[PDB]
Each structure stands twice: as C-alpha cells, then as structure tokens.
Amino acid sequence: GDVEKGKKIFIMKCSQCHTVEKGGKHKTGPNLHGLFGRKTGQAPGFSYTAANKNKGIIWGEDTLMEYLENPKKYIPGTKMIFVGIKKKEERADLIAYLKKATNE
C-alpha cells in the first residue's frame, strides 16, 4: 500500500475519532498505537464495549481489511459508528499507513 494515500484517508475518515501516535489521546475512539499484533479491545485506559472486548481476534492486515470494510458486521454491538471503506485499494493504503504510524 501507499502510506501517503493512507494517511490522507486516515485524516479524512478516522482522525475525528482516533489518534495514532505513541502516547496519543483517546477521543471518541481509542488511541491506536501498538494496534498490530494485539488482541481486540486492549488499548490501556479506553472503555470498550463488551463486543469489542470479546471479539477475540488479533489485529493485522487480514482482520483489519475485513473490519474496515464493514465494522458493524465484523463486531456486532460495536460503538464505532462508521460506514466502512468500500474500495480494497483504499483499505490497503489505509492499513499500510496504520502499520507504519501505529508502530513509530
């Protein structure tokens, strides 16, 4: 994926509710630093739904590709109210961006 295009998607569609930087603040949604390789519902200090907490998958490319296409479908009960990203390449670019940004 194209990290620069993914950053732009992040800003447009996610940044209203999420930060990515280490030590970044929780907002409507959790800070996302350290997301990759982590169980659902584990950002310290954020109050998740039981659904988010109990989904019982590990975040990575494959699970993010599915989740971000249709959040409610993947995690019924979630309080992330977001329509999803329809286009595969946009999801790929966004996830490439997140893989970098949530690690650095």
Ligand code: HEC
């Ligand atoms: C507010 C209107 C949000 C928008 C826009 C996006 N997200 Fe979100 N996200 C939000 C909430 C309130 C939550 C917690 C949901 C719950 O049921 O507790 C989340 C959760 C996530 C997660 C899961 C995090 C985990 O630790 O398990 C991911 C990976 C996530 N959100 C990513 C994400 C992206 C990439 C977005 C734009 C495409 C996005 N979210 C939008 C609130 C909101």
